Amino acid sequence: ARVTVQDAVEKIGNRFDLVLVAARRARQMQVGGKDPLVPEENDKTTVIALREIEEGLINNQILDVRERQEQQEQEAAELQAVTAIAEGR
Amino acid sequence: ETLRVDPTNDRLSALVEIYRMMRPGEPPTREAAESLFENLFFSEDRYDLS
Amino acid sequence: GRTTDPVRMYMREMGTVELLTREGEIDIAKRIEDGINQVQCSVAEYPEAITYL
Amino acid sequence: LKAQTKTEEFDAIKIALASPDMIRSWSFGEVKKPETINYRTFKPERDGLFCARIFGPVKDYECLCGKYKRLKHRGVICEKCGVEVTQTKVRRERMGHIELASPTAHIWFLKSLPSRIGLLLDMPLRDIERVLYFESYVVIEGGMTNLERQQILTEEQYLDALEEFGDEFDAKMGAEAIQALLKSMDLEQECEQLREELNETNSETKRKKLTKRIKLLEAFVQSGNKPEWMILTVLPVLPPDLRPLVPLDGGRFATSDLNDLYRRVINRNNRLKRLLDLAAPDIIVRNEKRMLQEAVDALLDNGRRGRAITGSNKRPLKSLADMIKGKQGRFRQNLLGKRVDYSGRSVITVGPYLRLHQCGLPKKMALELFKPFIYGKLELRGLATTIKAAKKMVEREEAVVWDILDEVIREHPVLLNRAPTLHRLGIQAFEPVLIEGKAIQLHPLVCAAYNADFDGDQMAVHVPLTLEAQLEARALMMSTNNILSPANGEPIIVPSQDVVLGLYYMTRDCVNAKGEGMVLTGPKEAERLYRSGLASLHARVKVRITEYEKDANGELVAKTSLKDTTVGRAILWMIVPKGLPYSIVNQALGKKAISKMLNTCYRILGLKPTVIFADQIMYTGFAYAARSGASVGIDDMVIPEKKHEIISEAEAEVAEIQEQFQSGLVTAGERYNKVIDIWAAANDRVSKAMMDNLQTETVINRDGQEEKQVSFNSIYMMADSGARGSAAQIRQLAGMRGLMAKPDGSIIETPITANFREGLNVLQYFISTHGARKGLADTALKTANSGYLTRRLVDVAQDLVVTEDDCGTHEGIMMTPVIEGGDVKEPLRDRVLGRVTAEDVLKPGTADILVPRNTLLHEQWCDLLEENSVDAVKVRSVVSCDTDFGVCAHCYGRDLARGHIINKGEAIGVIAAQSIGEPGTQLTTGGLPRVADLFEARRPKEPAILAEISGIVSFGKETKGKRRLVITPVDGSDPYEEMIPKWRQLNVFEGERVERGDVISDGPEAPHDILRLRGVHAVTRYIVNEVQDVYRLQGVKINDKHIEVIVRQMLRKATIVNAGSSDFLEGEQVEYSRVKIANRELEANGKVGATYSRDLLGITKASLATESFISAASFQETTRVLTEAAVAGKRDELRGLKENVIVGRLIPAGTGYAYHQDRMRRRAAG
């Protein structure tokens, strides 16, 4: 369990945005699109996300970057799919 | 001075102002004012201290 | 004069009109007869009213 | 990009008058009949208050006649009776209407205090009503004949006038007349003419009313509402499901009161149409029209005419206005309260075994609470086939479900709450620990935050469903994350009673005991010495200890030494973490000291070590207090041996003064004062007797004959440590208790001679009873007073939130120690702590900057300022903050449950109000009503008058009611003469110069004055100092900040002096004004900038003004607010807390601040 979030509050200053970011990440884990970045102790996604914040390997910057990259990861897949839609003309 | 503030003169007048006090806005009547005032504190029916 | 609560503004407004005499009733009824029979006669004087019937 | 048509996520809201065609737009049919249901088959009669055709199908996706019963046929209108088969919920949605025969006035616009139809037409109310009742004729568009436009006539007058003028003159009566008035009204023309008339004549009485009225007019014009709409042509009907006919047990039906009303309206209306088609006489149709007016009025808002009663029941029927308003003063459901799922509650118990980050929860409770989670997790692993079977499993309570519950509980926090919620700590998050029992276990250290006793107090539990709620609870509402009261940086986790008696009993020293004067290597063998029974817990002993100091740079220094201390202190030292010096535990450890221990530990080691430290302190406190064997006997309370003697002597005095009254040497009242004085002095004597005795009387021998120390007696240790009891109560246990005072307040001259250890007889007890009853009554009253105060406070602040980061202003208030009377009622260090310097400060010598510019002053900065002699620091405050529509974090301070600077987006107004309000139960002109008076800015009863302007003054004129005072400035003119009643003893010297704001008389003064004459900083200083004078005298710690934000909200409004944009005398937001003048100093007009004057509005007054009308409808009078907004067509954009709470979306603060921001900028932009 995570008794105090002070360390996470150290990694990202705002402390509300801590809740938001850790939330978003915890969601990334809870509805599984992804896996933890650090060993799961049986800790629920709620705490795993916080452990990820405390280790400084997860925050708003990192998440935004990863997501932005994944958009192009899908664009690459559907590259030949959507260009086949030239029937639009 | 109480008399100096009294708008009325005779008994009928007083009963008029009283009946118009208790049941205001409706036209007063002699039998009405009399019946009211007699039925307030003087009627064995509508009143008692026991 | 106006105490609101239309029970009054009615009760007083009607109280103005004086009660009818036993003769006045007959007067009014006679006036009724005059009016009506007038319109009936006016109807009888119209050709289309007949032809329609 | 096509903008949109259908459903989006809506912003703001709009409110205005309703058009007949608009009313029809909502209406999906006209209700033509008073009938409800058929009376046998309960189906709705067509075209009635309850109807399938107009409103909706009785049962889901089914026609009334029953032809199309299939879920397939949906958008189908039935041929038999048109009913589109769709969910029954639509019968809760679709509205209706009624076409009224004769026009009707909307009672909300007739009877609202500033009658709308009245002042819009510039016509008196009584006239308009007299016209509505057909009592008189009113003119419309008189033209040029003999008569005015708004003029009123009578029967005979109207007849004569008509006889004179056939046409070019117009008069009507009834509702049609008022409608004709409003419709013929041309607002623009009135605007032009009124502007001219405003400009021509010079009189105050004239142009005041003139400007007010033109402003009103043009406002109503810009609204988009046309006056005609104040008169209802069409009457909308509320959906049937919102006024249900639904049946009950025993075949009995129950329906709302709106049906009686609506039915009445329909009836009278239809009967009116009937009487029209019968060509009835005037009187009849008039009576009918009036009756219709009354019915409609009673429907809309009942009680403003006759108070109509419901069928067979005396109690007046509830109208739509009452439906909206609600009850319990002003409570609109999002206020009074709302039922919530996933919750519970029960009696609470102790659970000392718990860590402070957790708490006990009953098994069954946790089962029923987490039930959905339990289902989903049961079938996720595969223990249950389907959700049904899962329910069957948890219903049977199979052995396998308990483990799954242990799974879903683990990292999942829960919210705990108490009944009297005041400060934010009233609700705190904990980690659930499954416990066998029906009782909730609550960690002892938190029992202070809730103000919860163990006497049967109940707590409630809520489950943080969504992920965001889990993380919100864990990172904010969590217990460990708030260790510090938001009111002041002092720890609220301070040990309570048993624990402090434990730590007190531990570290203390009796003169002689086992192992006295020996030496030990370390705390380990000290404890080992104690447990074995070889050495006593308390003995003076030298032992070697290793203490750390982190005084190096981010680094712990280690040093060892032989400390002269006691066995108990040595044992306790094991707990004290790291860099804390041994000195802290070398004392007697009272409640105050044991608190300062935790404090220092937090300001040194940080959060986590403070948490674990506190936990350990609780555990050891309980353990050693248990071992201590502390108890209370009847002999533990020691009465002075000299008591009876003091009693007798003070009793001789009374007969001395009595004999003097017998001989007439003294008067009656003076005698009374004398006897009361001697008895009081007696009580003081016995008190300070038993105190000395009970305190130091322990007389014990070490190696010599005698010596004496502070007593080891139980009740004393209890009172001295601060565990419980106090000198006041102990005084009542041993010595005599006080003198009592009859309800009148006249204090009886025969005090209570006996005490509780002794017996009280009949009289004494009877006399005490009144004191008791007045005690309970007064306290129970002051709870309510506190509540009301907090309410006014949150209402006046609320939406104030930290928004911008830094406004960057050098502005601030001068922070000095309070220095009242004799020495220092409060230091400088506390006043400036956790705040930020407006500008850099100096040493005695300069070009050496200790604290640069704006920096947070923490313990090190404040002690660095304490090293130096600096008596003066200018500090940034929330009252002087340059940021408009909010406070910048750089202005506020660091104060929070955490030592770091205040976060961006935290809502400070709320927490400020809560902080001011929580202690309010602990407050005793002076007192709590004094505080209420202060925040209300009420002018006192017998105030003082400050000098208007500096310079020499003299006494003008003579006696009529006043003797005029003539002021004479040095350079400028002297028109200023104030009329001061001469029957009030003056102060000001007839021959001396008086600075503006000097004392021209005595008594308290209204803060309006202090603001105007002495300045803004001056008045805020007066308020904060006076209210702090009230609290501090009671022993209440509240930081100046919260009070200062309340103050900022008080002065939010100001009245303009100069011109060039808006009106002259308008009171308006200093935010709006300052933003407009700062914007007008450059560009625009070169400089047209207008001067204002700061205004002081009381809290309850400043609460009145809120942009959002939905917010105003909450705590104010709803009926007025809705109208008064609806006329101007006011558009509520939300943007505040209360409004967003009502509308049910994320709060524009806290976590939601990242939302409303990313929105607010997207709005009014690209």
Ligand SMILES: [Mg+2]
């Ligand atoms: Mg209690």
Ligand SMILES: [Zn+2]
């Ligand atoms: Zn049908």
Ligand SMILES: [Zn+2]
């Ligand atoms: Zn600021």
